[PDB]
């Protein structure tokens, strides 16, 4: 059937939708279709064509109220890629508190992690019951499921600037150094490559967590 209303969604609303590039972009909701128990959402993008999307691949174009966000909530967030910025999907790992300076910790679908503000987040419209189950990468999916279900039990390694450790990249262990700690994240310098990455302090990419 063709619908005009579904839950709190209305045809003609402005929305964010997931493109095939896996980045999210502004558009208009132009149709809502049912087939038995299933629902699809037709979006016309501003600088593009059209897609027919599942409800977990559209997001509201406003910032979620804080009382609506939990550990495990499915969100789109500001993602830094060199000097460019995109909107990319993730899971809320921490809500604002004193130890994190009142920020949200995000675990992105590709395995990166970052702290963001409320003004950098958007809520996915129709998340799955197990919110992690639409994460395509299997290693990322299983790690996030374990994290969200074990929370608040969160093993982490205690690290200090200048400490030498081994860190994983592309299947092998690399000599590295702790440059800085910011709440639950550590900035690691890969010593051969002379470039850095922010990594979650409970990540199994840190050799002391791999061991456990
Ligand atoms: C969720 S996170 O710690 O930022 N990244 C991550 C992703 C995948 C694995 Cl197997 C381990 C860690």
UniProtKB/Swiss-Prot annotation:
Signal peptide start and end residues: none
Domain Tudor: 68-131, 158-212
Localisation: Nucleus; Cytoplasm; Chromosome
Expression sites (tissue/organ): Widely expressed. High expression in testis.
Subunit structure: Part of a complex containing at least CDYL, REST, WIZ, SETDB1, EHMT1 and EHMT2. Forms a complex with ATRX, TRIM28 and ZNF274. Probably part of a corepressor complex containing ZNF304, TRIM28, SETDB1 and DNMT1. Interacts with TRIM28/TIF1B. Interacts with ATF7IP and ATF7IP2; the interaction with ATF7IP protects SETDB1 from proteasomal degradation and is required to stimulate histone methyltransferase activity and facilitate the conversion of dimethylated to trimethylated H3 'Lys-9'. Interacts with CBX1 and CBX5. Interacts with DNMT3A and DNMT3B. Interacts with SUMO2. Interacts with MPHOSPH8.
Function: Histone methyltransferase that specifically trimethylates 'Lys-9' of histone H3. H3 'Lys-9' trimethylation represents a specific tag for epigenetic transcriptional repression by recruiting HP1 (CBX1, CBX3 and/or CBX5) proteins to methylated histones. Mainly functions in euchromatin regions, thereby playing a central role in the silencing of euchromatic genes. H3 'Lys-9' trimethylation is coordinated with DNA methylation. Required for HUSH-mediated heterochromatin formation and gene silencing.
Domain observations: The pre-SET, SET and post-SET domains are all required for methyltransferase activity. The 347-amino-acid insertion in the SET domain has no effect on the catalytic activity.
Protein's UniProt name: Histone-lysine N-methyltransferase SETDB1
Organism: Homo sapiens (Human)
